[PDB]
């Protein structure tokens, strides 16, 4: 399932999780020019160990 | 008769000037958008000769 | 304290003259304050605060405009005045441009 | 119209507009006149608010 | 009381704060005249009328000359 969360976050920026199983930390109701500034925060517990930090800063 | 002509013309002239200045005052609040004020007095007469002084309130 | 002698102290603060020297000005002073004892414009201390701020931005003293936010805070902190909007408008109505102000007062 | 800046594309000519910085009697006309040149669209993410405030200080000097 | 005397110290502070606001807004008022105006605003008064008072009283001292 993380290879169905790290195989569509690479391509089309499509994600949906209810309980957080991935390092996307959304901020609600941000669709303006603060979208380039927010709605994403690199949560540091949902990054798997075979990845590295640069891989996770790129997909975001 | 010049009370049926000239005095009546002056009464109408007074009322027309009053309506005109009230129109220009109520038109100045409205923000080619200000061309409506410019066209009516392009020479610059009959427009805001008095500012309507502020009271001691 | 009664307001009529309290207004009589005001006319001897602005004028240098005594109250047995002039009573003609003070009669005119009650003529303007009286019957205009309730607000002739609507109140908000928020808008008047943003116009003392916009004046300090106009002078590019914008470190003092955020020091002013603590000066607007102190007036709320006592809470004995409810006409906090009025006295800020009063210094704003009598405001002029120094082009700059240096050596700050308060505390 | 009298000077040569009318070779500009219409967008930036529409984006600029005179900005007032508040009436204060005793203040000459030179100190309150500055253009705004606001910015909207997707390009506004590069030109943040803090950038515009610092440009206003540069203009005032 | 005691808190009713500590607030007198704190309004003595507030008058100096308003004096700083008076000098950065460049108004010719001192600590003493503002102390009349705060007591007037306690009873409730218009700053629009006080501004007209101050603009007339300073411009009628050469009319009592």
From Swiss-Prot, chain B:
Component of the gamma-tubulin ring complex (gTuRC) which mediates microtubule nucleation. The gTuRC regulates the minus-end nucleation of alpha-beta tubulin heterodimers that grow into microtubule protafilaments, a critical step in centrosome duplication and spindle formation. Plays a role in neuronal migration. Disulfide bonds: none annotated. This is Gamma-tubulin complex component 2. Component of the gamma-tubulin ring complex (gTuRC) consisting of TUBGCP2, TUBGCP3, TUBGCP4, TUBGCP5 and TUBGCP6 and gamma-tubulin TUBG1 or TUBG2. TUBGCP2, TUBGCP3, TUBGCP4, TUBGCP5 and TUBGCP6 assemble in a 5:5:2:1:1 stoichiometry; each is associated with a gamma-tubulin, thereby arranging 14 gamma-tubulins in a helical manner. Gamma-tubulin at the first position is blocked by TUBGCP3 at the last position, allowing 13 protafilaments to grow into a microtubule. Ubiquitously expressed. Belongs to the TUBGCP family. The gene is TUBGCP2. It is found in: Cytoplasm, Cytoskeleton, Microtubule organizing center, Centrosome. It is linked to Cortical dysplasia, complex, with other brain malformations 15: An autosomal recessive disorder characterized by global developmental delay, variably impaired intellectual development, speech delay, facial dysmorphism, microcephaly, and varying degrees of cortical malformations including pachygyria, thin corpus callosum and subcortical band heterotopia. Most patients have generalized seizures.
Swiss-Prot record, chain C:
It is found in: Cytoplasm, Cytoskeleton, Microtubule organizing center, Centrosome. It comes from the Eukaryota. Ubiquitously expressed. The modification Phosphoserine is found at residue 107. Component of the gamma-tubulin ring complex (gTuRC) which mediates microtubule nucleation. The gTuRC regulates the minus-end nucleation of alpha-beta tubulin heterodimers that grow into microtubule protafilaments, a critical step in centrosome duplication and spindle formation. Component of the gamma-tubulin ring complex (gTuRC) consisting of TUBGCP2, TUBGCP3, TUBGCP4, TUBGCP5 and TUBGCP6 and gamma-tubulin TUBG1 or TUBG2. TUBGCP2, TUBGCP3, TUBGCP4, TUBGCP5 and TUBGCP6 assemble in a 5:5:2:1:1 stoichiometry; each is associated with a gamma-tubulin, thereby arranging 14 gamma-tubulins in a helical manner. Gamma-tubulin at the first position is blocked by TUBGCP3 at the last position, allowing 13 protafilaments to grow into a microtubule. Belongs to the TUBGCP family. This is Gamma-tubulin complex component 3. The gene is TUBGCP3.
From Swiss-Prot, chain E:
This is Mitotic-spindle organizing protein 1. Associates with the gamma-tubulin ring complex (gTuRC) consisting of TUBGCP2, TUBGCP3, TUBGCP4, TUBGCP5 and TUBGCP6 and gamma-tubulin TUBG1 or TUBG2; within the complex, interacts with TUBGCP3 and TUBGCP6 to form a luminal bridge with actin that stabilizes the initial structure during complex assembly. Interacts with TUBG1. It comes from Homo sapiens. Keywords: Acetylation, Cytoplasm, Cytoskeleton. Required for the recruitment and the assembly of the gamma-tubulin ring complex (gTuRC) at the centrosome. The gTuRC regulates the minus-end nucleation of alpha-beta tubulin heterodimers that grow into microtubule protafilaments, a critical step in centrosome duplication and spindle formation. The chain holds residues 11 to 75 of 82 of the full protein. The keyword Lipid biosynthesis does not apply. GO terms for biological process: gamma-tubulin complex localization; microtubule nucleation by interphase microtubule organizing center; mitotic spindle assembly. The gene is MZT1. Signal peptide: none annotated.
């Amino acid at each position: 399932p993380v290879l169905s969360f790290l195989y569509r976050w690479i391509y089309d920026g499509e994600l949906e999780d209810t309980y957080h199983e991935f390092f996307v930390a959304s901020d609600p109701t941000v669709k303006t020019d603060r979208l380039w500034h927010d709605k994403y925060t690199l949560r540091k517990s949902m990054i798997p160990s075979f990845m590295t930090m640069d891989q996770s800063r790129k997909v975001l | 008769l010049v009370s049926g002509f000239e005095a009546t013309i002056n009464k109408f002239d007074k009322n027309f000037s009053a309506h005109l200045l009230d129109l220009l005052a109520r038109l100045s609040i409205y923000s080619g958008m200000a061309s409506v004020i410019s066209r009516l007095d392009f020479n610059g007469f009959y427009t805001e000769r008095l500012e309507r002084l502020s009271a001691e309130r | 304290k009664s307001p009529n002698v309290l207004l009589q102290n005001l006319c001897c603060r602005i004028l240098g003259r005594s109250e047995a020297d002039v009573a003609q000005q003070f009669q005119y002073a009650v003529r303007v304050i009286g019957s205009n004892f309730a607000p002739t414009v609507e109140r908000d201390e928020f808008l008047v605060a943003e116009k003392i701020k916009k004046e300090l931005i106009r002078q590019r003293r914008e470190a003092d405009a955020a020091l002013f936010s603590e000066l607007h805070r102190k007036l709320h902190s006592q809470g004995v005045l409810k006409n906090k909007w009025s006295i800020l408008y009063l210094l704003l109505s009598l405001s002029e441009d120094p082009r700059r102000q240096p050596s700050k007062v308060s505390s | 119209r009298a000077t040569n800046a009318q070779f500009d594309s219409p967008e930036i000519l529409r984006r600029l507009d005179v900005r007032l910085l508040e009436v204060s009697p005793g203040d000459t006309g030179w100190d309150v006149f500055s253009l705004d040149y606001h910015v909207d669209g997707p390009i506004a993410t590069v030109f943040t608010r803090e950038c515009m405030s610092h440009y206003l200080r540069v203009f005032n000097f | 009381a005691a808190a009713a005397a500590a607030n007198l110290n704190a309004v003595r502070e507030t008058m100096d704060v308003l004096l700083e606001i008076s000098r950065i807004l460049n108004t010719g008022l001192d600590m003493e005249t503002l102390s009349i105006c705060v007591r007037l605003c306690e009873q409730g008064i218009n700053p629009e009328a006080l501004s007209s008072v101050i603009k007339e009283l300073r411009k009628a001292t050469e009319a009592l000359k």
